[PDB]
Structure 1
Amino acid sequence: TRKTYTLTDYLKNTYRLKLYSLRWISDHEYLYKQENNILVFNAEYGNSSVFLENSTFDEFGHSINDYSISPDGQFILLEYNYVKQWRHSYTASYDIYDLNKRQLITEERIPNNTQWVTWSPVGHKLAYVWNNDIYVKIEPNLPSYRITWTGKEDIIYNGITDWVYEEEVFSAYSALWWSPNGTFLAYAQFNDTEVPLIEYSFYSDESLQYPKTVRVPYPKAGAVNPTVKFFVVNTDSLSSVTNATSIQITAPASMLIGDHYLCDVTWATQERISLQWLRRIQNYSVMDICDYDESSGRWNCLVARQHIEMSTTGWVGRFRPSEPHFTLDGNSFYKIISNEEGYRHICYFQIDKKDCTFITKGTWEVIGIEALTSDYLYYISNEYKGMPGGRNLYKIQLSDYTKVTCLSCELNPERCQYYSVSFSKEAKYYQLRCSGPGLPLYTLHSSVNDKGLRVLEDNSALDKMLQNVQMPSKKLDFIILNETKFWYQMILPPHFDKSKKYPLLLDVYAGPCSQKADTVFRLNWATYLASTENIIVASFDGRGSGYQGDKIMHAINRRLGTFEVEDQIEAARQFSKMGFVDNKRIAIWGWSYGGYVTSMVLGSGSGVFKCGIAVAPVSRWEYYDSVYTERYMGLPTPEDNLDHYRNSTVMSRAENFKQVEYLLIHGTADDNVHFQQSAQISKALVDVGVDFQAMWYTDEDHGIASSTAHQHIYTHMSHFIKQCFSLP
């Protein structure tokens, strides 16, 4: 009798997915790490050489966290002393190694505690941020040029984002953008002077006698937001003038009338940059397209080139307005936008014409534009088989939009329904990454004839291992509610018997534009629960969920904590109707937005769920950050949406928790969903005399991701679910 997939299997990673992470360094070569060597591969033929021997930095004296080769291949940037900050931010030390001289550079070193560093896109210039100011090095061994003097910790951020811009706008710490050949350096400056601070304790190692108070500028909903300015400096002038001028590009008048955000920066040509701005009320966005004026040294944005993007039903974009993809001449661009039927499709714009032309259409959506050549646009969508949870690569002929080829659909239709892609520098080659429903499969292809060159990684090692394991299966299907298809997945125990009644765990996220029903292969907690504990683990994408049109996505506009919550309850009712679910043993759990929905469900009075677990939940929208929250909720003012902000809190449902078993879990150093949010849930439950289970994680953040804390939380939750389901 084959073993099952156990909790220790999951926690110890005994069954490991192999990846194939390559780095394109040109149109036909990529870098690959094998046995701590860096190998260079020829894409066409598959032959390789040692780029950098594993032993090169044995006497470096530091463990190297990561590396970055300069575009011209002359230098390598070595990252060490890595210290994580938020989701994307960190600080580190850096050395530069001269590849031709086979020597480490010892003069004019990048300082310690550097916040961000990037090569220019061509050559070997560097820009870096240190103590919140921008510096540029033209040559790796030569003195830096200081670009800004206003940097001030927690106050003025030059070339890097503050907390909210990092998390909600740019999904990145970096706020600088080199022009295509590296002449210009564009950057944003954030001013957080009047932004309130979140403060929480950090306990550190037990040696620390007094806890530290962490203080972060963080605008909660309706609070004072950071302000932003945008600048461009000519780096080619740096060695000729004592103090090169950063030229400001100001937001349009339609943005300056009130609070606003900078939400996109994309260079079009060597002398043309596009910027998108978003009103604090996030249903109106403006793109400016700005040209360098050689005679004046200024940047001018013609109103004839300004593009408006607005929504009447919701916010703009999935999580932000989409990025433009410019044709080589910079005179036109492609952008994903919601069409008249509410489906996101590719629109083609001339820079000085306001009406665009849709080049794709249908009741499905484009997920991303991946590459653009003179003859073809390459994009990912969920068109194939009308499955919103599948992903395939397509190629559209620019001279003939009727000519659309699916590049991945039929490669291995049984094994592979969810692709992402990695193109070489001028799209001569592409790596396809299949992530399910079978084992991930990595392959290489030539763009010239769309032929498969070779399999890079097929996970045959893991396949072999898993043959000895009673693995669960996955069902992906839909139910019809109010004449609309809503998709669900079930992780089903091995030897699933439809004539039996199984306990069911509803695994919930359900945030706006979320997707929890898909074709991705996962080895996770659900695998164990199904394989070992014979629990069905289900997920459902109801109103508010993504990739299915605006009618579904915008259904929760200004009304978080309503339809997406009800639809999870209704999903559980529907799963009972299916006949293989023990109605006495239905649980629900979720993390983050999923913790909020879980708590709302457990507090609803539905009687459907026996028990549930919320991990790091939102409990009240006024506690969460402005950019994310206001996107869906508008402002917490009597004139806008305060009534709904107050009506959608977990705390107001406290009395209903008498009907359920609840486990509430939060990390004490969560900078994102503050521990405050669960502190207020627990206090409300205490106040109405409701017993529940609790667990804090000392010094853990929103990920609760440290090795020991990760193992501890899943161990704790497993005991809780098993007790609830009367499982020995």
Structure 2
Amino acid sequence: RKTYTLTDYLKNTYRLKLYSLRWISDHEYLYKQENNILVFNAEYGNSSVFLENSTFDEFGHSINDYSISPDGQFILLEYNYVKQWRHSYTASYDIYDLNKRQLITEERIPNNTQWVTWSPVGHKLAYVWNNDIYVKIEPNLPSYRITWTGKEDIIYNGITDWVYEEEVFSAYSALWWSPNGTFLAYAQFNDTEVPLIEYSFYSDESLQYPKTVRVPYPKAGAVNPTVKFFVVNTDSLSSVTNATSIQITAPASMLIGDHYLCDVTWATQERISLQWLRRIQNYSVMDICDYDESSGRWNCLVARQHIEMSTTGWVGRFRPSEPHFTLDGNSFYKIISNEEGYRHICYFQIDKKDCTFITKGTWEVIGIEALTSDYLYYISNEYKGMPGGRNLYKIQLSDYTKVTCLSCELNPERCQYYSVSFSKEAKYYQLRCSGPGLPLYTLHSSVNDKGLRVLEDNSALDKMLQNVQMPSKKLDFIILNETKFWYQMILPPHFDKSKKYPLLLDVYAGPCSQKADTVFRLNWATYLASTENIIVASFDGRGSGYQGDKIMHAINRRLGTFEVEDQIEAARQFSKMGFVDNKRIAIWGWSYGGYVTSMVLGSGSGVFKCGIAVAPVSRWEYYDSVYTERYMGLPTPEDNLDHYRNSTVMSRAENFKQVEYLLIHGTADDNVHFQQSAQISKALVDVGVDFQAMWYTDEDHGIASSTAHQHIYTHMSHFIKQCFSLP
């Protein structure tokens, strides 16, 4: 009979059970039960202890994560974890020999190691320390330095700089072992001329003088970092002296101007594919290079080049898709936009220029998951024509007309959103269901796709939620200009359309994003609907993804227009449904959602009463180049400079006199710098409009500190409750 309180959300009273496993072979995986690392047999479900939970309570340090070598002879323990950016971090590492049950004390991995990674097979080790690459053949023998140009904030070897980590590779690592560990392919980034973003870091109050953090950050139109690619043979490190790292340059179509390295994928033991991207991200080229046995060099024939361009915007969703090569490495499958604007799987020959689409329709393929000699497993939103749904399909390679869905009918009521984790050779796979019901985990056999057992069904959480007045979720669409636009609402319990509720428009609306899906969540919206009786609505307008290039490319070179206007129009549609209080419609958003929310509140529409903007973008010349230029081009007069200045929130400061505005931003935000919100407030002051503000000391773009997280949602809860007059 209780509601879902703010305390329940902040104190995490109702936890979603998970089942995170790590496949070590084609029929075995690892799992943590009572902090004991168990090894399971997928065929029969029985397990055995692989590492006791008391083995490392004598360690003296709180182990943050482990990493077992593929051959099972060693395990890398990382401690003193200190987060850096979204993916990068710094920590200490120790190697534990499993054939001796002892810690490695000789030739320990150096402190301040920036990244560690095992080889795909065996137990080789490559790590980045002081921006240089080292390789250890044995965990206890001395290392072999590979790079020598590594310089702080200038030269990156084996690791990415800020932009590449965030906007290109989505990872800190810039290393790529060959399939059997023979070769080590790495990239080198040079941020010599890249300007530095500078902001104060205050740290603990014991620090007398504030600290100044300086990070190479290429803003829109600024000097980008350069990149070089290398491949070194780690087998020659025995008679190493100074091992030679062979360089692979970019095609001539990329050397004419600024470019990026956007994908690295090995095909065979002696074949690696590289995808390059121009700074004008509408033209990318895949390069397939084979290892020359006699020359010791790498050669990429022009006949094996593959160009992927776009005539109505950028190429790919956030980057050119990654290829999935067959066993022989002479052909690959890749997601690309077809002539109708829908992204499907195309079959490429390593030699032929034209590819053949194996899937088609008014829907898109989210990703390729596994490839065997028989079938290719992919995820898509084809089922019931719902762009917000995810299901695992299986397409027959010998006949593209034989497509079977493996998750559509497992539980259509409870499960409409799926992810999959296949075994080493696609013999088994774990299906991850995340909505609209409670999460469900199941194991399966690829021989006939039978359900072996249920790993986790959240039956414990289901019982707790029975005596709780949980909200309901409606997933539907509206029609704007003969086009379906999907939306979702978190409806308060005992929803009655005879009444009129307050409306909170939860907004992100970033390019190729999706806010209306079938995923089940326990977040701030759950509390606002359950306890405060507030409808939390989300709307996927123009610019959202997984619906075709016609919608996703609608905001190309025009950020802050249709995306913003579609959110305002969505509010008008909701109020015209009967159960929305017109004088109590709010809007809030984080990151890109903060930018859209600010542009909405400064549009003079009069639709919204109040609004919250957390870590918002103010003007796009303040954001990084690779992301901004992808959708906005260059901020030069001969290019899209006119809209760079026409789409700032500062230029709408006057309209903020009609709304109640709350601006929040972390002082240590490395992504969307505090500069952005500092310019918003100063513009509002210059025109004399009052607003509420809140900075968070040393919090970054996530404001994920346990105390800060509880403090921000508490502060936003009061602002929303007072705006709606809710006691």
Matching residue of 2:244 = 245
CA distance in structure 1 between the aligned counterparts of 2:496 and 2:667, rounded to whole angstroms: 43
Q: Deviations over 1:228-282 (max 9, x none)?
A: 0000000000112301100000001110000000000000000000000000000
CA distance in structure 2 between the aligned counterparts of 1:274 and 1:684, rounded to whole angstroms: 49
The residue matched to 1:401 in structure 2 has which SS? coil
CA distance in structure 2 between the aligned counterparts of 1:103 and 1:722, rounded to whole angstroms: 57
The residue matched to 1:402 in structure 2 has which SS? coil
The residue matched to 1:554 in structure 2 has which SS? helix
CA distance in structure 2 between the aligned counterparts of 1:680 and 1:488, rounded to whole angstroms: 32
Aligned length: 727
Q: Deviations over 1:70-123 (max 9, x none)?
A: 011111111111111100001111111111211111111111110011110010
The residue matched to 1:35 in structure 2 has which SS? coil
The residue matched to 2:402 in structure 1 has which SS? strand
CA distance in structure 2 between the aligned counterparts of 1:52 and 1:138, rounded to whole angstroms: 24
CA distance in structure 2 between the aligned counterparts of 1:305 and 1:105, rounded to whole angstroms: 46
The answer to which of 237-246 and 652-661 deviates more is: 237-246
CA distance in structure 2 between the aligned counterparts of 1:709 and 1:58, rounded to whole angstroms: 30
CA distance in structure 2 between the aligned counterparts of 1:78 and 1:526, rounded to whole angstroms: 38
Structure 1 length as normaliser, TM-score? 1.00
CA distance in structure 1 between the aligned counterparts of 2:5 and 2:240, rounded to whole angstroms: 66
CA distance in structure 2 between the aligned counterparts of 1:484 and 1:496, rounded to whole angstroms: 28
Q: CA deviation at 1:158?
A: 0.1
**Are residue 606 (structure 1) and residue 608 (structure 2) matched?**
no
Matching residue of 2:454 = 455
**Are residue 381 (structure 1) and residue 377 (structure 2) matched?**
no
Q: Deviations over 1:642-682 (max 9, x none)?
A: 00000000000000000000000000000000000000000
The residue matched to 1:230 in structure 2 has which SS? strand
CA distance in structure 2 between the aligned counterparts of 1:390 and 1:68, rounded to whole angstroms: 33
Q: Deviations over 1:662-712 (max 9, x none)?
A: 000000000000000000000000000100000000000000000000000
Matching residue of 2:508 = 509
Q: CA deviation at 1:383?
A: 0.2
CA distance in structure 2 between the aligned counterparts of 1:524 and 1:84, rounded to whole angstroms: 24
Q: Deviations over 1:389-408 (max 9, x none)?
A: 00000001111111111000
CA distance in structure 2 between the aligned counterparts of 1:104 and 1:376, rounded to whole angstroms: 44
The residue matched to 1:157 in structure 2 has which SS? strand
Matching residue of 2:106 = 107
The residue matched to 2:267 in structure 1 has which SS? strand
CA distance in structure 2 between the aligned counterparts of 1:378 and 1:419, rounded to whole angstroms: 13
Q: Deviations over 1:168-193 (max 9, x none)?
A: 00000000100000000000000000
The answer to which of 257-266 and 96-105 deviates more is: 96-105
CA distance in structure 2 between the aligned counterparts of 1:16 and 1:615, rounded to whole angstroms: 25
CA distance in structure 1 between the aligned counterparts of 2:104 and 2:697, rounded to whole angstroms: 41
Seq. identity, %: 100
CA distance in structure 2 between the aligned counterparts of 1:669 and 1:724, rounded to whole angstroms: 29
Matching residue of 1:172 = 171
CA distance in structure 2 between the aligned counterparts of 1:398 and 1:511, rounded to whole angstroms: 35
CA distance in structure 2 between the aligned counterparts of 1:123 and 1:395, rounded to whole angstroms: 32
The residue matched to 2:721 in structure 1 has which SS? helix
Q: Deviations over 1:140-170 (max 9, x none)?
A: 1111000000000100000000000000000
CA distance in structure 2 between the aligned counterparts of 1:104 and 1:724, rounded to whole angstroms: 59
The residue matched to 2:117 in structure 1 has which SS? strand
Q: Deviations over 1:479-521 (max 9, x none)?
A: 0000000000000000000111100000000000010000000
CA distance in structure 1 between the aligned counterparts of 2:360 and 2:191, rounded to whole angstroms: 42
CA distance in structure 2 between the aligned counterparts of 1:243 and 1:81, rounded to whole angstroms: 33
Q: CA deviation at 1:199?
A: 0.2
Matching residue of 1:371 = 370
Matching residue of 2:276 = 277
Q: Deviations over 1:121-149 (max 9, x none)?
A: 01000000000000000111111000000
Unpaired stretches in structure 2, ≥5 consecutive residues? none
CA distance in structure 2 between the aligned counterparts of 1:509 and 1:684, rounded to whole angstroms: 23
Structure 2 length as normaliser, TM-score? 1.00
The residue matched to 1:201 in structure 2 has which SS? strand
CA distance in structure 1 between the aligned counterparts of 2:106 and 2:158, rounded to whole angstroms: 24
Matching residue of 2:344 = 345
Q: Deviations over 1:537-556 (max 9, x none)?
A: 00000000010000000000
The residue matched to 1:215 in structure 2 has which SS? strand
Moved over 2 A (4+): none
Matching residue of 1:409 = 408
Matching residue of 2:29 = 30
The residue matched to 1:627 in structure 2 has which SS? helix
CA distance in structure 2 between the aligned counterparts of 1:705 and 1:65, rounded to whole angstroms: 17
- The CA RMSD measured in Å over matched residues stands at 0.4
Q: CA deviation at 1:428?
A: 0.6
Q: CA deviation at 1:431?
A: 0.1
CA distance in structure 2 between the aligned counterparts of 1:100 and 1:198, rounded to whole angstroms: 48
CA distance in structure 2 between the aligned counterparts of 1:58 and 1:533, rounded to whole angstroms: 45
CA distance in structure 2 between the aligned counterparts of 1:195 and 1:552, rounded to whole angstroms: 34
Q: CA deviation at 1:344?
A: 0.3
CA distance in structure 1 between the aligned counterparts of 2:114 and 2:82, rounded to whole angstroms: 10
Q: Deviations over 1:413-468 (max 9, x none)?
A: 00000000000111110000000000000000001111000000000000000000
The residue matched to 1:679 in structure 2 has which SS? helix
CA distance in structure 1 between the aligned counterparts of 2:91 and 2:685, rounded to whole angstroms: 44
CA distance in structure 2 between the aligned counterparts of 1:288 and 1:467, rounded to whole angstroms: 56
The residue matched to 1:73 in structure 2 has which SS? coil
Q: CA deviation at 1:597?
A: 0.1
CA distance in structure 2 between the aligned counterparts of 1:108 and 1:93, rounded to whole angstroms: 14
CA distance in structure 1 between the aligned counterparts of 2:652 and 2:293, rounded to whole angstroms: 63
Matching residue of 1:262 = 261
